[PDB]
Ligand binder design. Structure first.
Ligand SMILES: N=C(N)c1ccc2[nH]c(Cc3nc4ccccc4[nH]3)nc2c1
Ligand SMILES: [Ca+2]
Ligand SMILES: [Mg+2]
Length: 223
């Protein structure tokens, strides 16, 4: 997250860190047994880490649970990143408490102008590399689809939306991939892609979760 702030320990209780010997993507807990992340974060051998703040220090509120199965969306296209979403089932149910909570799926899509909270342990520099050890947060609004499509001609589908600041300065970045975009208490997006980070006229692109609620509900109930 570039131009964001330190969230504070366990203030984003549904945020998860996917680890394969190191943190490589974020995710969101949707219930005690399931996590949603981005399909481009797919890897075999994932351990889901819940209740994390500093990912390099065991502070006492973590729960590390291995994944039993991963399901990438049936229509995920790695070349265009269309349908960039995946579900991960935990081998054991997480213990929900104040520090570990699930986030609600949306009943409708959010409007342009709605402010959301984006979080993650990704890069914090636009030009350079600095990976933080504690969770960073960013409040950003959903942008109109017209400004989103003008920034990326021929690359935005109805399963994506842009959020951020066209002036640049504030954005999600690599390492934040797969993490949550929560607006009005519902999980509306997943950090998917963008052009560099925090660049002028290059906002971040997010998977539009409201288009996948039936697939999510149906898939978790059958697995
Ligand atoms: N700038 C962004 N919003 C962005 C988020 C995640 C990501 N992952 C990769 C690879 N690039 C990006 C870019
Ligand atoms: Ca920790
Ligand atoms: Mg994240």
């Amino acid at each position: 997250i570039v131009g964001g702030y330190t969230c504070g320990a366990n203030t984003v209780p549904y945020q998860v860190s996917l680890n394969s010997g190191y943190h490589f993507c974020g995710g969101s807990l949707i219930n005690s047994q399931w996590v949603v992340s981005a399909a481009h974060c797919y890897k075999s051998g994932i351990q889901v880490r819940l209740g994390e703040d500093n990912i390099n220090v065991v502070e006492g509120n973590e729960q590390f649970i291995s994944a039993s199965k991963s399901i990438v969306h049936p229509s995920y296209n790695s070349n265009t990143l269309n349908n960039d979403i995946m579900l991960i089932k935990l081998k054991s149910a997480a213990s929900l408490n104040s520090r570990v909570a699930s986030i609600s799926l949306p009943t409708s899509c959010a409007s342009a102008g709605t402010q959301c909270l984006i979080s993650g342990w990704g890069n914090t520099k636009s030009s350079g590399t600095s990976y933080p050890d504690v969770l960073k947060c960013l409040k950003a609004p959903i942008l109109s689809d017209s400004s989103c499509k003008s920034a990326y001609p021929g690359q935005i589908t109805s399963n994506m939306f842009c959020a951020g600041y066209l002036e640049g300065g504030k954005d999600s970045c690599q390492g934040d991939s797969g993490g949550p975009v929560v607006c009005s208490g519902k999980l509306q997006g997943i950090v998917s892609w963008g052009s560099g980070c925090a660049q002028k006229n290059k906002p971040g692109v997010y998977t539009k979760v409201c288009n996948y609620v039936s697939w999510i509900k149906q898939t978790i109930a059958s697995n």
